[PDB]
Amino acid sequence: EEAMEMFREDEGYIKEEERPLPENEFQRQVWLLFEYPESSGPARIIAIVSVMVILISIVSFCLETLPIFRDENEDMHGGGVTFHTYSQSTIGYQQSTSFTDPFFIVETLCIIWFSFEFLVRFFACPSKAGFFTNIMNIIDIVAIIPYYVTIFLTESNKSVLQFQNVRRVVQIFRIMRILRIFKLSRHSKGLQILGQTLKASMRELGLLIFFLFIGVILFSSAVYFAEADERDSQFPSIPDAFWWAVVSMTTVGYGDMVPTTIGGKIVGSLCAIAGVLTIALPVPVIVSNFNYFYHRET
Amino acid sequence: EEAMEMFREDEGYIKEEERPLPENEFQRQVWLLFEYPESSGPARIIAIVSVMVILISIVSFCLETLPIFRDENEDMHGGGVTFHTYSQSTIGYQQSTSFTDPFFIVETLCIIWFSFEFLVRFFACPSKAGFFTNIMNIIDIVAIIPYYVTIFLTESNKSVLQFQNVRRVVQIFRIMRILRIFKLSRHSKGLQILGQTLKASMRELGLLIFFLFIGVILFSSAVYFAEADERDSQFPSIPDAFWWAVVSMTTVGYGDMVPTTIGGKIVGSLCAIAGVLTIALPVPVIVSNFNYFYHRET
Amino acid sequence: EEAMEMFREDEGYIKEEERPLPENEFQRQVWLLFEYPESSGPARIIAIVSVMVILISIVSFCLETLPIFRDENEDMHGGGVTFHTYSQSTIGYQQSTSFTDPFFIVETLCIIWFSFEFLVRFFACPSKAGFFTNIMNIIDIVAIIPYYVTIFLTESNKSVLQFQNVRRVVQIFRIMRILRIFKLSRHSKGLQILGQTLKASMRELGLLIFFLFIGVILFSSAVYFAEADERDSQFPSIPDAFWWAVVSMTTVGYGDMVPTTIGGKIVGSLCAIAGVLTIALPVPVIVSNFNYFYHRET
Amino acid sequence: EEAMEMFREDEGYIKEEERPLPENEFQRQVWLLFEYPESSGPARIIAIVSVMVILISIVSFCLETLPIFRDENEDMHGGGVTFHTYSQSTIGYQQSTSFTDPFFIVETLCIIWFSFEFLVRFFACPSKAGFFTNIMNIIDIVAIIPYYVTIFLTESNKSVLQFQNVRRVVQIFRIMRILRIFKLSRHSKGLQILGQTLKASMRELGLLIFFLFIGVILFSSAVYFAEADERDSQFPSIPDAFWWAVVSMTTVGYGDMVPTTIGGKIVGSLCAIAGVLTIALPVPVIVSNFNYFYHRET
């Protein structure tokens, strides 16, 4: 049994996964209801629920921004900014105990599900200390927080001049809601394969960014000086032209700004070729890993 | 003979195709005239006809939309909308027993060929009940339908206020004519290989769309809030910015809308790289299958 | 010696190249001076000359079009059209026995080299009948012809009303000069490998064009009807939208015309993905051949 | 020991690296402090310093161009040109013994490090003659020079009418500062793998450029004549259209100029496909080498 384990690790057939139960025999049993969808029919249903749950939050998150509805705000004409209208304009919902804001309800509804997932999952974990080394528990935590950041801003604060301390910092938090989408990782097998391919390429991915950081700087400058002697130049500075080379090394290619001089085109056309020769060097490094981690289940 | 068949299936040399005739001995014989082009010279000719047939419909379909001819319509100046002018403007041809509309003739001509293909092929099929599991018979059916839907709209309807019930539903049908192009599958060997490669990738293709659906939502939002505090922003909402990230993860890159702020470019430039790292993960999954299904004839 | 040749052909080590000399013993000897650069120092020199010759013609061809010089034409203001100014405006040079046009000299100089290559190569060929099956002799012929087509229009014609018979047909010929660039094939080893890779892919390349021809039609139509109900639509017809889908299946992506409606974007964004899934299916079919034909010299 | 070395070279396990010390025993000992970071803690620190050094110069180089600061120049309004304001406008810093220009200090500070790297590295080299064959010493030299070219222009010249001799030649030098970024090659292992992959591809890379040079010329001309008979054409000449085909063979795709005629689109759409069939032929030639040179450390 000892030289067989050294054989499979060389082979890579290393599956040491053994889910220990919580030992309560119902603290154990209910734990497996929320750790394994394959134990029963209703065990699937929880996954069937929670996968659908995340989508409901997202559509509710995206529709707040819609100008059928953000133009149907408290500032439907958009004249000033109030302390209570800051929530309708920079938090995207109207907090009220009456809760006439429909989205503010729908936002809140999923959070009740997420904690009752998570907290019940926290109380029934066998491994208590190493709970926060698991990455698929971290996303659970970061999801539920700007909910509470919203409320403590509303409940605790009864004062003036709070926007001069932190107001766009609140607007940062309105983004960071967006990484609730990573909660699908617990359900998709395939999204974890991305999560492992990146985990197995964190140095070779750094070959890409560093080779692009070289490519950006070299050709942003070299086009800036060939487009230098215009009064009418589209390239005012070199950190303007960092936007230009990533538009043209990644071959997206926009048209917002394009070189105009005879030299700036000759410079500009090398950068089109060299972006192929910068992305494609460490891409098949990655994709061979992803192909390997995909069929590694077989 | 028993352990040889288990050998070839492991190998993949599994060709169990055996075309049974219809047994009529002319019901059988004429069936093979319209199932196999290789039985005779004229057996090729039917395929040589029917391949040329489909093209004639397409050019006749596309030229209806041309403003040498849709501007040479009954509303050549475009003032109003009549019940009979709905056919020339939303069905694309003028139905008449005189049939002065030339395209309306040419459209009708191919349909006579298609049924006389199909209906004769229906009566001479050996497999009678399993006729509608064959996908290359489904396209035959979907081709001939909006022809009849056009006529029943003309024949049965003599009444007022029909556009308030279904008029854009008619305009849907004018699209669905377009999938007559898939009828070439019966003739091209290579188009069926695409039909099989997709048939062997319907989960791994779903890795692509789901990894892109992740990529779209994450960066559409993250550019929306870095482009937030403009009165002059090109990004009014987040479902506006779903158009933006598929223009920029697929590296098409249009120029209709591009970020402008300092933050929106830094967000916007990550999304150029990440679209490479989203398409290219399950593409060589597919292309290895297609290369495998191509030479599988050898 | 017989089962060794069957071995190498299976292997692919099939090099039956045996250059028979012209047998004149100076017709033979001068032949190797103009077929093999490796026989001597001066044998290289002709190859060094003729490679430099082609470039001289090209720069002379491209500079005619330059508006430092085509605006310095006989119609420097561009008011009318003369029969003698047709050469300076649609043949790009001024033919005269004085030949004051400098480019018209430089154009003429190279043709003297090409024939004295070719005609001397014609008279000293061992194989006289199969001379015109060799493709690298066809390019020799097609190069020298529109030179003579230029002169016969000048020399033979002294009459009126020739532009109503053929005038843009002359302008066709001014293009077809451009395939003089393929004359480098006799000199580059690498350009012939492209010439062989295409020669070994003429069916599998046809998988690409036909899969793209499917992709173009299916999405040009499907965006035309989602962009139909505008008075302000960017898509007037469907053969307008053939330009649109090759801008967007090949992911070039211009911005001349982009969909605007909610449906036209959803249609338009599928076509971005599907162009990856159309180019990349028969590309590694080709590139595996090119990699094979490249190192086939080793 | 003799047939083992012939074995490893076939294998490619050829590591003949033997760093001979300078033999001074402190000239030797200090040499390893500036050639090997792995000898000690402080040996790392010099590499930790000098990697951070280069970045400081770059940010200082890029920020000079910023119109928070180049508009805060001596010509903050930009009316004329002085002999002393040429440094603030075309050398990017204000040279003085007072040195009130802050960047001109920060520029100067890094050069003191680079020479004290290099000159100390020069005096302690074992190999003195072949010092300038090593490429990672050339980059050291070309870095430090336009610093001195700046000073000798200021120190030696006290005269008039120097701009009519060389003024944009000075502006050339302001670019050539930019290749100080290649100094990271001594530190990154991965950037040298790029440096070796290009060193192992200098003929096969030339397959790419020459196949593109063919592709550019053939389609720039062929679109010029299909877009010829406009008064309103976007393509004035053929070397205008060299910018067009590299925008469209590399599939960047800008929108600055796009064909408009019916023929110019049919020409223009072939060039989209053919740029895929020109980049992708010698790319996996390269990327296989880079993948090989990456893991060649293992």
DSSP chain D: -HHHHHHHHHHT----------SSSSHHHHHHHTT-TTS-HHHHHHHHHHHHHHHHHHHHHHHHT-TTTSSSSTTSS-----TTHHIIIIISS---SS---HHHHHHHHHHHHHHHHHHHHHHT-S-SGGGGTSHHHHHHHHHHHHHHHHHHHHHH---S--TTTSSHHHHHHHHHGGGGGGGGGGT-HHHHHHHHHHHT-TTTHHHHHHHHHHHHHHHHHHHHHHT-S-SS-S--STTTHHHHHHHHHTT---SSS---SHHHHHHHHHHHHHHHHHHTTTHHHHHHHHHHHHGGG-
CA angle D44, D48, D51 (to 5 degrees): 135
Contacts of D139 (CB under 8 A, 6+ apart): D179, D180, D182, D183, D185
User: Of B153, B117, B107, whose CA–CA distance to B31 is shortest?
Assistant: B117
C25 torsion bin: left (phi>0), alpha (psi -120 to 50), beta (else): left
CA separation, residue B92 to residues B88, B166, C67, C106, C216 (Å): 5, 17, 47, 57, 21
The alpha-carbon gap from B67 to the nearest alpha carbon of chain C, in Å, equals: 7
Name the resolution in angstroms: 4.0
Give the residue from C292, C275, C276, C132 showing the smallest Cα distance to C201.
C292
Contact criterion met (CB below 8 Å) for C210 and B190: yes
Q: Which residues of D touch B252 (CB under 8 A)?
A: 253
Gap between the Cα atoms of D76 and D67, Å rounded: 10
Of A229, A251, A258, Cβ closest to residue D256: A258
What's the CA gap between A104 and A151, in Å, rounded? 11
DSSP state of C210: H
Rounded Cα gap, residues D254 and C256, in angstroms: 10
CA dist C78 and C92 (Å) reads 14
Most A-contacting residue of B204, B207, B212, B223 (CB-CB within 10 A), to test interface = B207
From the list C156, C278, C162, the residue with the least C-alpha distance to C216 is C278
CA-to-CA distance for A191 and A139, rounded, in angstroms?
Answer: 14
Q: Exposed, middle or buried by CB within 10 Å (0-12, 13-18, 19+), for D294?
A: buried
**Residue A215 and residue A245 in contact, taking contact as beta carbons nearer than 8 Å:** yes
Chain A, chain C: beta-carbon pairs less than 8 Å apart: 7
Nearest to C250 among D221, D251, D284 (CB): D251
Q: What are phi and psi of A123, to 5 degrees?
A: -75, -25
At position D218, the amino acid (one-letter code) is L
User: Cβ of D237 and C65 within 8 Å?
Assistant: yes
| Token duo for residue D256 | 């600055």
From B3's Cα to the closest Cα of chain A, the distance in A is 26
Q: Which two tokens stand for residue D14?
A: 């050829």
d(CA C207, CA B53): 21
- Check if the beta carbon of residue B223 is closer than 8 Å to that of residue B264: yes
* C-alpha span between D6 and D12 (Å, rounded): 10
- Residues found in chain D: 298
d(CA A36, CA A186) in angstroms, rounded, equals 11
Distance CA C179, CA D217 (A): 10
Give C65-108 as a DSSP string. Answer: T-TTTSSSSSSSS-----TTHHIIIIISS---SS---HHHHHHH
Q: Exposure of D76 by Cβ count < 10 A (0-12 exposed, 13-18 middle, 19+ buried)?
A: exposed
Question: Which residue from B18, B194, B164, B191 is spatially nearest to B86, judged by alpha carbons?
Answer: B164
Q: Which residue of A has its CA nearest to B212?
A: A191
Alpha carbon distance, N-terminus to C-terminus of chain C: 23
Residues of A in contact with B286 (CB under 8 A): none
Q: How far apart are CA B95 and CA B157, in angstroms?
A: 13
Tell me which residue in C207, C252, C258 faces B190 most closely, judged by beta carbons: C207
Burial annotation B170-190 (CB, 10 A radius, 16+ → b, else e): beebbbebbebbbbbbbebeb
Tell me if A191 sits within 8 A of A184, measured CB to CB: yes
Residues of A in contact with D58 (CB under 8 A): 217
Residue A211 near residue A274, CB atoms below 8 Å:
no
Helix ranges, A156-261 (H): 168-176, 189-199, 204-226, 241-249
C-alpha span between A283 and A207 (Å, rounded) = 10
* Residue at B27: amino acid letter: Q
* Amino acid occupying residue D242: F
Which SS3 state, helix, strand or coil, does residue C181 take?
Answer: helix
C284: chain B residues, CB-CB within 8 Å: 287, 291
Following DSSP, what letter does each residue of chain B receive, concatenated? -HHHHHHHHHHT----------SSSSHHHHHHHTT-TTS-HHHHHHHHHHHHHHHHHHHHHHHHT-TTTSSSSTTSS-----TTHHIIIIISS---SS---HHHHHHHHHHHHHHHHHHHHHHT-S-SGGGGT-HHHHHHHHHHHHHHHHHHHHHH--SS--TTTSSHHHHHHHHHGGGGGGGGGGT-HHHHHHHHHHHT-TTTHHHHHHHHHHHHHHHHHHHHHHT-S-SS-S--STTTHHHHHHHHHTT---SSS---SHHHHHHHHHHHHHHHHHHTTTHHHHHHHHHHHHGGG-
Distance between CA atoms of residues C154 and C175, nearest Å: 19
**Structure tokens belonging to residue B48:** 């040589």
Interface test with C, best of B60, B68, B169, B254 (most C CBs within 10 A): B254
Distance CA D11, CA D278 (A): 33
Q: Which helix (H) or strand (E) holds A287?
A: helix A283-294
Mutation test of the interface with chain A: which of D170, D193, D250, choosing the one with the most A Cβ atoms within 10 A? D250
The backbone torsions φ and ψ at residue D75, rounded to the nearest 5 degrees and listed phi first, read -95, 75
- Collapsing DSSP to helix, strand or coil, A253 comes out as coil
Query: Which residues of D are less than 8 Å from C287 in CB distance?
Result: 280-281, 284
* Nearest-by-CA chain B residue for C208: B190
The string over A192-207, giving b where at least 16 C-beta atoms fall within 10 Å of a residue's C-beta and e elsewhere, is: bbbbebeeebeebbeb
Question: Distance between CA atoms of C91 and C84, rounded to whole angstroms?
Answer: 10
Q: How many CA atoms, within 13 angstroms, populate the side-chain half-sphere of residue D244?
A: 26
Looking at the partner chain, which of D207, D248, D273 has a beta carbon nearest the beta carbon of C190? D207
List the beta strands (DSSP E) in chain C: none
Q: What b/e sequence results for A35-56 when a residue is b if at least 16 CB atoms lie within 10 Å of its CB, and e otherwise? A: bebeeeeebeeeeeebeeebee
Buried b (16+ CB within 10 A) or exposed e, C113-144: bbeebbeebeebbeeeeeeeeeeebebbeebb
Q: Who among D214, D236, D252 is closest to C181 (CB)?
A: D214
Encoded amino acid at B79, one letter: G
The CA-to-CA distance between both ends of chain D, in Å, stands at: 23
The CA–CA distances, whole Å, from A183 to A178, B211, B230 equal: 11, 14, 31
* R_g of chain A, CA atoms, integer Å: 26
CB-CB under 8 Å, B253 with A252: yes
CA distance A263 to B284: 39
Distance of CA C16 to the CA centre of its chain: 30
Alpha-carbon radius of gyration of chain B: 26
Quote the Cα angle for A284-B198-B58, to 5°: 115
CA–chain centroid gap for A221, Å, is: 32
Contact call for residues A260 and A244 (beta carbons, < 8 A): no
> Which chains have at least 3 CB atom pairs separated by less than 8 Å from chain B?
A, C, D
Distance to chain A for D249, nearest Cα, Å: 9
Which pairs count as long-range contacts for C187-191, CB under 8 Å and 24+ apart, including other chains?
C187/C47, C187/C50, C187/C51, C188/D210, C189/C297, C190/C294, C190/D206, C190/D207, C190/D210, C190/D211, C191/D210, C191/D211, C191/D214
Of A171, A208, A250, nearest to B251 by CB-CB distance is: A250
DSSP assignment letter at A258: -
Dihedral-angle region of residue A251 (phi above 0 means left; psi in -120 to 50 means alpha; beta otherwise):
left
Kindly give, in sequence order, each residue whose CB lies less than 8 Å from that of residue A53, ignoring residues fewer than 6 positions away.
A110, A113, A114
Ramachandran angles phi, psi of B219, nearest 5°: -95, -20
3-state helix, strand, coil in chain C (%, to 5): 65, 0, 35
List the structure tokens of C270.
């599928």
- Closest chain D residue to the Cα of A272, Cα to Cα: D250
- Neighbour subunits, A (≥3 Cβ pairs < 8 A): B, C, D
d(CA D230, CA D234): 9
Quick check: C252 and D252 CB within 8 A?
yes
Measured between alpha carbons, how far is D231 from A214 in angstroms, rounded to an integer? 43
Experimental method: cryo-EM
3 state SS for A75-139: CCCCCCCCCCHHHHHHCCCCCCCCCCCHHHHHHHHHHHHHHHHHHHHHHCCCCCHHHHCCHHHHH
Q: Which residues of A touch B211 (CB under 8 A)?
A: 190-191, 194
Query: Min CA distance, D180 vs chain A (Å)?
Result: 10
Q: Rounded to the nearest 10 degrees, how much is the dihedral formed by the CA atoms of C146, C151, C152, C153? A: 90
3-state DSSP of D127-145: CCHHHHCCHHHHHHHHHHH
3-class secondary structure, C293 = helix
The closest alpha carbon to C57, from C209, C221, C179, C232, belongs to C179
Q: Quick one: CA dihedral C297, D3, D6, D12, positive or negative?
A: positive
Token digits for A69?
């509805």
CA distance A8 to chain D (A): 22
